[PDB]
């Protein structure tokens, strides 16, 4: 899925 709050540079979620 898209990241968002995580950021394009943030760690990835399933």
């Amino acid at each position: 899925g898209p990241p968002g709050g995580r950021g394009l540079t943030g760690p990835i979620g399933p």
Partner: antibody, heavy 116, light 112 residues
């Protein structure tokens, strides 16, 4: 246009305290994961602390070198990140950048000097 | 701590030439079929600017001449054709494992 402004840097003596804060506009703050990074000549660029969004329980994480000395926190209503820094050491000297969306966005930085 | 070592420390590249800057991670940084590796440019007196994410993807408005590539251990940033504004320090940065870690930096000088 996205903007992050740090304040609350300056001079303070070892063991003392200082509260840095960070004003953020231009992105949906409540959703954003925020962080503090610091830069000094000796150590380079050091990620200091993270704080995740409301969906992720505002989870904090820190560099082991500042655990239980620094505390990161936020006000999703004010769109503001805070770094409470306690028992400050000479190695904590550096420029502190506040970043948004992990490290997508970066403020201009506020300088902290920890010297007697 | 997954430690990044960049090479070289600095180079000096003529205009319209290739500038290749490499990053070496002490453990793999791939997560969920995506390589967790980013690149930053720091121009003098300024904060680091985000350039590349997911090893090979492009930041918004980030010029075509910047592009990254790699997988697992070894990544690189490729600037070509180089221009006068590309004089900066370049960091690679890892985002799989906490702590999130920055390389020590690589200085690009532009030859004239």
């Amino acid at each position: 246009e996205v903007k992050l402004e740090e304040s609350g840097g300056g001079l303070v003596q070892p063991g003392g305290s200082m509260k840095l804060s960070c004003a953020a506009s231009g992105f949906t703050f409540s959703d954003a994961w925020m962080d503090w990074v610091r830069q000094s000549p000796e150590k380079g660029l050091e990620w200091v602390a993270e704080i995740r969004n409301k969906v992720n329980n505002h989870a904090t994480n820190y560099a082991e070198s500042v655990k239980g000395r620094f505390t990161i926190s936020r006000d999703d209503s004010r769109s503001v990140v805070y770094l409470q820094m306690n028992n400050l050491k000479p190695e904590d000297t550096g420029i502190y950048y506040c970043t948004g969306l992990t490290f997508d966005y970066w403020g201009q930085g506020t300088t902290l000097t920890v010297s007697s | 701590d997954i430690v990044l070592t960049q090479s070289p420390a600095s180079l000096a590249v003529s205009l319209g030439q290739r500038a290749t800057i490499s990053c070496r991670a002490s453990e793999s940084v791939d997560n969920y079929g995506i390589s967790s590796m980013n690149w930053f440019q720091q121009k003098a007196g300024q904060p680091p600017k985000f350039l590349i994410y997911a090893a090979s993807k492009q930041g918004s408005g980030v010029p075509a001449r910047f592009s990254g590539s790699g997988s697992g251990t070894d990544f690189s940033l490729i600037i070509h054709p180089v221009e006068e504004d590309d004089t900066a320090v370049y960091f690679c940065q890892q985002s799989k494992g906490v702590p999130y870690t920055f390389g020590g930096g690589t200085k690009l000088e532009i030859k004239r």
